[PDB]
DNA sequence: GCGATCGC
DNA sequence: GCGATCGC
């Protein structure tokens, strides 16, 4: 049972574990880059309170996946690791004498716009957006832009290039309902 | 997670349960009774080592299910709750200083033999067997047998029955793949 | 709306 | 194979 936290206290959070995240690597201890560190969720929207929090790792390779959420390490943090795959990972951490949830989430550098703006959300926000693009007989994933479960290939490499060249109006997370 | 046990220690776990399971019903503490509680899973199929322990609980009105689960008492036992809904509620439970998941599933009155079918297993024996099914335009499932999205009305109670009835060779859950 | 990780 | 719970 995770508490809930103020957007202060979520941001001290992310900005603590953006230099202290690893992962091992066949008995390597492998560095996570803070500029491959994403906070997302609630927190990326500038809500007041959060019931957790939220970080989209950026992996370089297909072939890390199996090793990154799996052997995750955080140094100097005590937390326990509930369920854990290689596309999600939730963790309980303390933080000054109290437990929050922290979500870990994994992307391919090719994936990056299209995860950013699926764990942006709000749910509300994707739900509405993928119905009108499911009416033109397209998916869209954290993935990528699917027709007839074949990739788009977009030229594209920001959220906001996505969102424009998926035809809908961009707004600043905050403002995205 | 939770630790590996024998049978005979599994067998001793759903017994000492048998008796000492309820749920806070709006207040007031409402016992399951024994022969309400199915064990399945690996236990059924008597397999010599269990990873956890699984439990059915035949619940006899669709009203009750918003409060069987969410509100699970066990008289006596220490434990604490991993996840949980209406449907299916993951526990970690103390036994004689070591940690145990016990899964617990509910099925209503009607869906019993479908239920017991289905927790027993093994997946591999369910896969071929819906898989077959599947191909007559047909859908099992823990609740029902379906044809075009309508629940087939067998008339069947228990599981050997229903196993009869779909045309299947019917065997002992030792002795299902 | 869509996918991850889990249940059998 | 099919569904539950939980991520956004
Ligand atoms: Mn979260
Ligand atoms: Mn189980």
Request: some cysteine.
């Amino acid at each position: 049972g995770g508490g809930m936290l103020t957007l202060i206290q979520g941001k001290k959070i992310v900005n603590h574990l953006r230099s202290r995240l690893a992962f091992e690597y066949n008995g390597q201890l492998i560095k996570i880059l803070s500029k491959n560190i994403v906070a997302v969720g609630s927190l990326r929207r500038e809500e007041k309170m959060l019931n957790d929090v939220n970080l989209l790792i950026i992996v370089p390779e297909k072939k890390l996946l199996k090793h990154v959420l799996p052997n995750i390490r955080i140094k100097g943090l005590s937390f326990s690791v509930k369920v854990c795959g290689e596309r999600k990972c939730v963790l309980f951490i303390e933080w000054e004498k109290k437990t929050y949830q922290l979500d870990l989430f994994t992307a391919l550098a090719e994936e990056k716009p299209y995860a950013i703006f699926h764990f942006t959300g709000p749910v509300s926000y994707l739900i509405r957006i993928r119905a009108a693009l499911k009416k033109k007989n397209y998916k869209l994933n954290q993935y990528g832009l699917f027709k007839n479960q074949t990739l788009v290939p977009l030229k594209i490499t920001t959220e906001k290039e996505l969102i424009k060249e998926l035809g809908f109006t961009y707004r600043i997370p905050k403002k995205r309902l």
